[PDB]
Design a protein around this ligand. Sequence first.
Ligand SMILES: O=C(O)Cc1c[nH]c2ccc(O)cc12
Ligand SMILES: O=C(O)Cc1c[nH]c2ccc(O)cc12
Lengths: 259, 257
Amino acid sequence: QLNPESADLRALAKHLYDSYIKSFPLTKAKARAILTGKTTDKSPFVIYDMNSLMMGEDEVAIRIFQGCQFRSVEAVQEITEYAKSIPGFVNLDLNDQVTLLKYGVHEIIYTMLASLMNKDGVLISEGQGFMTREFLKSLRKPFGDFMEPKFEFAVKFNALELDDSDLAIFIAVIILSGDRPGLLNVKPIEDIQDNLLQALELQLKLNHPESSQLFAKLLQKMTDLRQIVTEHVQLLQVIKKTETDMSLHPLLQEIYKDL
Amino acid sequence: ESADLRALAKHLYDSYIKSFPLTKAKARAILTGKSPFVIYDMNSLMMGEDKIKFKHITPLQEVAIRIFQGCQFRSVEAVQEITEYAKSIPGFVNLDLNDQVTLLKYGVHEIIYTMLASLMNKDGVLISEGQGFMTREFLKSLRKPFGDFMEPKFEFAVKFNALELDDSDLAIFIAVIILSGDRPGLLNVKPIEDIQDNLLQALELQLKLNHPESSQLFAKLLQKMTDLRQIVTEHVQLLQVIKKTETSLHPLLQEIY
Ligand SMILES: O=C(O)Cc1c[nH]c2ccc(O)cc12
Ligand SMILES: O=C(O)Cc1c[nH]c2ccc(O)cc12
């Protein structure tokens, strides 16, 4: 029914779930509680136009983009804190540690960003705001499409119906890759992930009995992430040329470099 | 064991062997221990056309261009082998005709590189039913954009072949790839996903029974699907950049491709 074996993997599930709660202020559970309206005090102020973008504080395209940019830098921070708590992660070559974060941080950001989205928009400013997909798609030329592929992924991905205890493990599997470019020590990294994969596989089986092969369906979604990430950097480089007065955060510049 | 899955597995394996001339097992014997004609440079390629007489892709009345053309001729040839295998997958044929076309259209490039891996090692790849072996370096030896056409694939193969899968495994892995419900333009996704789910259980059992030793191999293999997509898009980009050189006379040839 559950031997020494699984028992250890559950202990790992719990451990990761706990660090996740402790590292990310806005879990999917809270995100969805705000979005479904199962509240009165948790309801968000909606921004669907310039008019409301104004009241919402109580050119824009860039004021918004740069808003995402720094929020993004903040996520790299929360994720880096989460990584450290991944058994074995800190025991690796400090170089490989940086490499895993370099390539992993964004795929993780979009995985989690889905938790704040629904087909119509996304929660912002810690859930207090809600920016609609349409207002975002209406931004001037370039910026009008930087969020669209995120919604794309989010709708398909949210369909898997995963909760925080699931994501916590899935997000760890993402960091502990190994096929990541320039890793010095691949075996050590692969020994961790193999362990994380069993954790997720069991976690999903127990958490979603009625959902068969969800493990594989979740694993296949990683292709979507890479594509998303690539597309982002690409749209990112273009903007760099069009808007030369707009900066980019150093940290963020170090992640996209040689990426 | 759900004999139903152990069945779908043998079925798929049986079809894989009938649809594909050169198998992973066959190709691993050559690479290791009637040796193929080795093509390591320009002169060896020359004698190769008269020897290997792989002149099915060449008689068409520029070394880097005749090589690239040659790969495409094989690619087309493979597409038919894949299309035939596809029809062996339980239920594939019963799908909406358009969706069957859609699945094959977006899966062929992924399956080709997946199987191309079977024919290559870190130092080269097997060509023409395995009669040849074009070295990997003579391929970087190519100028223009032709010097990085295959390189991204040797890299993929090295990571992929490391999984040490065999034809019984690849047979199911490929079925899974074709049955991808995220192909743009599909009309009725449910059927395709149900079948893929079904194919996923078979590949899972296949790998646990065939590779008890390797932990989570199923999971690791699925991950390779990422590198595959990346390999394909990147490849499609090359075919774009290459579209700036030139283009029985061509008119009809350019059409077949
Ligand atoms: O990827 C980046 O560095 C910037 C970025 C663009 N759009 C986003 C939406 C949410 C988020 O957290 C960050 C971003
Ligand atoms: O629900 C998730 O997967 C986590 C998540 C996504 N976006 C966020 C922005 C801020 C924050 O504290 C947490 C999150």
